[PDB]
Amino acid sequence: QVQLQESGPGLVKPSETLSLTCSVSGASISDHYWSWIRQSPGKGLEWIGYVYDSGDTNYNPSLKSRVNLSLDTSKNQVSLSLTAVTAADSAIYYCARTQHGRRIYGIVAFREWFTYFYMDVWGQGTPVTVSSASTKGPSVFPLAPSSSGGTAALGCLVKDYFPEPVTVSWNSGALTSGVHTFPAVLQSSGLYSLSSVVTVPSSSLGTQTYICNVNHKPSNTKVDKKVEPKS
Amino acid sequence: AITDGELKNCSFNMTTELRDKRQKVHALFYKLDIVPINENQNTSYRLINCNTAAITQACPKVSFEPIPIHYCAPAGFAILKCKDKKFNGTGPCPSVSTVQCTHGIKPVVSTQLLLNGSLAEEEVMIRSEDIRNNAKNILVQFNTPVQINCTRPNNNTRKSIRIGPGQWFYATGDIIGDIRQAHCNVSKATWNETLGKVVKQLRKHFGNNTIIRFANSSGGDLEVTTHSFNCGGEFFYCDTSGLFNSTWISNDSITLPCRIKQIINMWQRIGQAMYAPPIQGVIRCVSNITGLILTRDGGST
Amino acid sequence: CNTAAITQACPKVSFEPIPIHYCAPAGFAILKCKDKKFNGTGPCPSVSTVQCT
Amino acid sequence: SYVRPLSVALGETASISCGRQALGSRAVQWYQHRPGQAPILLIYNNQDRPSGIPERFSGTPDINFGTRATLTISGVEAGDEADYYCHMWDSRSGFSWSFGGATRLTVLGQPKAAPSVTLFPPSSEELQANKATLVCLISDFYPGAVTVAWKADSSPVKAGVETTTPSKQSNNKYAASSYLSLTPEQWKSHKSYSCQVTHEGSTVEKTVAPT
Ligand SMILES: *[C@@H]1O[C@H](CO)[C@@H](O[C@@H]2O[C@H](CO)[C@@H](O[C@@H]3O[C@H](CO[C@H]4O[C@H](CO[C@H]5O[C@H](CO)[C@@H](O)[C@H](O)[C@@H]5O[C@H]5O[C@H](CO)[C@@H](O)[C@H](O)[C@@H]5O)[C@@H](O)[C@H](O[C@H]5O[C@H](CO)[C@@H](O)[C@H](O)[C@@H]5O)[C@@H]4O)[C@@H](O)[C@H](O[C@H]4O[C@H](CO)[C@@H](O)[C@H](O)[C@@H]4O[C@H]4O[C@H](CO)[C@@H](O)[C@H](O)[C@@H]4O[C@H]4O[C@H](CO)[C@@H](O)[C@H](O)[C@@H]4O)[C@@H]3O)[C@H](O)[C@H]2NC(C)=O)[C@H](O)[C@H]1NC(C)=O
Ligand SMILES: *[C@@H]1O[C@H](CO)[C@@H](O[C@@H]2O[C@H](CO)[C@@H](O[C@@H]3O[C@H](CO[C@H]4O[C@H](CO[C@H]5O[C@H](CO)[C@@H](O)[C@H](O)[C@@H]5O)[C@@H](O)[C@H](O)[C@@H]4O)[C@@H](O)[C@H](O[C@H]4O[C@H](CO)[C@@H](O)[C@H](O)[C@@H]4O[C@H]4O[C@H](CO)[C@@H](O)[C@H](O)[C@@H]4O[C@H]4O[C@H](CO)[C@@H](O)[C@H](O)[C@@H]4O)[C@@H]3O)[C@H](O)[C@H]2NC(C)=O)[C@H](O)[C@H]1NC(C)=O
Ligand SMILES: *[C@@H]1O[C@H](CO)[C@@H](O[C@@H]2O[C@H](CO)[C@@H](O[C@@H]3O[C@H](CO)[C@@H](O)[C@H](O[C@H]4O[C@H](CO)[C@@H](O)[C@H](O)[C@@H]4O)[C@@H]3O)[C@H](O)[C@H]2NC(C)=O)[C@H](O)[C@H]1NC(C)=O
Ligand SMILES: *[C@@H]1O[C@H](CO)[C@@H](O[C@@H]2O[C@H](CO)[C@@H](O)[C@H](O)[C@H]2NC(C)=O)[C@H](O)[C@H]1NC(C)=O
Ligand SMILES: *[C@@H]1O[C@H](CO)[C@@H](O[C@@H]2O[C@H](CO)[C@@H](O)[C@H](O)[C@H]2NC(C)=O)[C@H](O)[C@H]1NC(C)=O
Ligand SMILES: *[C@@H]1O[C@H](CO)[C@@H](O[C@@H]2O[C@H](CO)[C@@H](O)[C@H](O)[C@H]2NC(C)=O)[C@H](O)[C@H]1NC(C)=O
Ligand SMILES: *[C@@H]1O[C@H](CO)[C@@H](O)[C@H](O)[C@H]1NC(C)=O
Ligand SMILES: *[C@@H]1O[C@H](CO)[C@@H](O)[C@H](O)[C@H]1NC(C)=O
Ligand SMILES: *[C@@H]1O[C@H](CO)[C@@H](O)[C@H](O)[C@H]1NC(C)=O
Structure with a gap:
């Protein structure tokens, strides 16, 4: 029972110092390894570096010059720093618990053994987009139900914003059935737009006070909106 | 690749069947068979023998296994x-x-350690030309044989590259599998027991009670410092520091590092070197260590 | 040239068989x-x- | 560089070869990666499967050299479809920083699912903001390949149309959405607006009109 949470900014200007944080809850940070992995669309996932428990570190030869790792003993937090970020450095960032492995193929005395690592427990991953563009708050407009029995459809609209992602809940997470949050779409304007609908019975419709809760961390804006039929 | 190399991958041009044509071939070599042609250093190497004497390739059909011979x-x-x-x-x-x-005497060419010989009956025998004189070696013959296992785990390969009309040169082919070095094993229980039986007969000539220590060879180089011998066609050279590393007064098998060469000059031969063609597959030979060849350090002790 | 070397038979020696008694x-x-x-x-x-x- | 494709019939076992084959004794890790989600390793040491992994996945144990590290998946199903990476650690090669080239596993014979389309007219609050957007939502359709054509009455719009590429949801079906940006005056002028979604040979159309 180990859980990892990556808290990142989600947006950083190019040629700046990107930073993240890997909080751990399962066990102490001084008994296992901690490694960061980044996955960008169109490119295979990339192992950048692990973290000793003490906390020497090795880094991938490609990013060896621009990355610095660190582990906090007071707080089970694995911090990752990265300098001279560009548009390519944008990708989903993971931090996983790595375990030590020792493969023996010959006689131990004469070396003949290599260490092999494997990450058994992963975090959820926090996205990070690097671009000069500024932040933009999302416009939330309710989608009125269309009015056979007894299925009915309502939802909310999240107009142009930036950057990904956006979290959508209903009644502060009170309703989970029939909830479908579709992926956003990037318009030529450069801002994403996503929708989120809920399928509720005709009956219930009248009145249950359905409200969608929207949140956009980079914009620092948390918005709620009511949804009700319109004449 | 590897970070922090006994054998090396060598490329070089060699003549072909036709006089005008040449060919580039790559073949693996051992560090001992080669020296750098620069020392400044660059990294062009040459065979160790080219400077002193010519070289001839041992025919692949003839075998080096000693068979009993009666004089x-x-x-x-x-x-x-x-x-x-x-x-x-x-x-x-x-x-x-x-x-x-x-009787059937096998011409086992060895060093330091005597292999496949005949075991002395009754007690172990200590034979020398002058025990008082340190300069003369000491022949030892065991009554109980100790067992020694030498192996070359590398799955070498034979590369047959024609270097002339009828002439064929057999080069080492890239190794298949892990890269492990040759080594011999000896049971520590038997060797400690056999070595104790030796010190008992040794005290019979150096006082019923005296300090008897054992150290590694500190004189000469190459052949005289390593337990050299042949095994399936490959010439082994093992470090015996692990066997002669004790001090005597009043299943956990020992392991010995063994390096291999393919260019050799045996019996102090000056003028002719031999190239031992590579042996295909894994090599493993179990031999009897029946005797020894010792020497005192001398001094004013 | 591909299989074995070659040597030129001396021009003086003759290949004519002569009677031989064993x-x-x-x-x-x-x-x-x-x-x-x-x-x-x-x-x-x-x-x-x-x-x- | 880029991914290599593999195709398997549904319910039939499949073998996934591993690129950059090992030179010596090896310990291989097989990772399962879904786009947007966290990678889950199936095999940490050739034949060792952490707790929770189903027994259907298996890998080849290097007992005698010459064997090729492969990933065997029995009872191939929808959830198996994914990208599989082969992390190689052999005795001859050094530190292996990079994972293997991705292997895109696709499951054939999956049952097609008709798309569920829901067209939403622009909200009154968007009209007060002097902007208008028609929102066409498509859910639970396989295979994830659709074309969206908008129409006005009869005429097609062909302008101001933005559509997401289909994405797989937890139902193992795809989901796509299309957005038509309009001016409030253009929304009131026409009688009705229609969203046409074509999936395989079928086509479903939904219509909405101003109040
Ligand atoms: C002359 O003298 C020399 C010096 O005395 C002497 O040197 C010896 O040479 C031989 C070869 O010539 C060497 O043999 C090899 O040894 C390897 C290691 O063996 C030991 O260690 C392993 C691993 O131990 C860890 O893991 C086990 C497994 O879970 C744990 O239980 C342990 O607690 C331990 O974990 C702790 O320690 C780790 C540090 O290592 C930590 O990281 C960890 O966190 C923990 O703290 C043990 O498994 C071994 O025990 C078993 O095997 C021995 C040897 O046979 C048996 O005696 C014993 O009864 C057990 O059955 C042992 O303790 C071997 O792994 C190796 O065999 C592997 O490699 C070969 C070739 O690469 C393969 O063909 C073979 O199949 C083996 O691979 C299997 O395992 C690997 C890794 O697990 C898999 O990746 C692979 O897919 C394969 O899986 C298959 O087998 C598995 C088990 O075998 C099985 O589970 C799978 O399901 C699958 O079927 C090889 O035997 C030896 O090391 C040298 N010794 C020394 C001291 O140097 C020389 O031989 C002498 N002879 C001469 C000169 O002729
Ligand atoms: C001190 O004394 C110790 C006690 O003897 C010594 O220990 C000896 O160590 C040597 C090695 O240094 C061993 O010799 C080698 O053993 C190899 C392993 O043997 C296995 O295979 C045997 C095959 O079985 C046959 O023979 C047995 C004999 O009784 C018979 O019962 C059986 O029915 C069958 O006919 C098996 O019996 C064993 O139990 C083992 O499992 C062996 O492979 C070696 O043979 C090689 O190499 C020698 C020398 O290089 C050649 O003379 C051989 O012809 C043979 O080479 C051919 O085969 C190779 C196989 O890979 C090829 O690579 C070669 O190229 C070659 O192939 C060509 O030639 C063939 C024949 O013309 C053709 O058919 C091919 O097409 C190719 O053209 C070798 O014998 C001793 O075995 C071992 N002794 C004992 C008792 O085991 C110790 O070495 C001594 N120490 C010192 C310092 O001297
Ligand atoms: C490696 O060393 C071991 C060390 O013992 C060695 O094993 C012994 O070999 C000898 C032969 O050299 C064996 O002795 C013979 O055994 C046969 C079969 O039992 C007998 O027929 C023989 O009897 C006679 O010959 C003797 C002289 O050898 C005479 O003393 C006697 O009067 C008979 O005429 C003979 O006893 C011996 O049995 C083995 N030891 C064991 C435990 O088996 C082994 O041969 C060595 N390996 C190699 C490759 O040389
Ligand atoms: C082997 O034993 C013989 C005994 O017959 C030794 O011969 C004697 O050796 C001593 C000194 O070691 C001399 O003083 C005697 O004169 C020798 N006697 C004869 C008849 O020669 C011989 O020295 C022993 N050899 C070894 C190496 O110990
Ligand atoms: C050494 O390597 C050779 C390969 O060159 C192995 O020979 C192969 O063995 C397999 C059996 O697993 C056969 O299927 C192949 O046909 C063989 N090929 C050749 C060219 O011989 C040999 O088994 C290896 N030996 C060891 C001890 O690892
Ligand atoms: C050298 O190798 C031989 C055989 O390869 C070993 O003899 C074996 O010893 C074990 C006991 O440890 C027995 O169980 C086997 O039956 C023996 N095999 C044979 C063929 O006799 C011997 O122990 C090895 N010696 C060392 C020092 O490693
Ligand atoms: C091999 O031969 C070619 C052509 O004769 C020559 O240009 C080259 O320098 C040679 N290389 C070596 C390493 O001898
Ligand atoms: C002898 O032993 C010494 C250790 O005192 C070691 O440094 C040296 O390399 C050994 N030399 C030989 C030839 O065994
Ligand atoms: C001799 O044995 C000692 C004690 O075990 C060990 O420290 C040392 O490395 C050995 N030296 C040689 C030359 O084997």
């Missing part, structure tokens, strides 16, 4: 065999018999 | 079967002895 004397002569169990180096042999030919 | 050493002898109709093997009724063929 016979012509008619009118005879051979007298001393059947005295406790017979030392020289002296009067009370029990004598006559034979026309000797 | 002789046996003292203490041995050669038995010649003088049976006209003598086939491959079998008992030869008429036998003579010679030192060389």
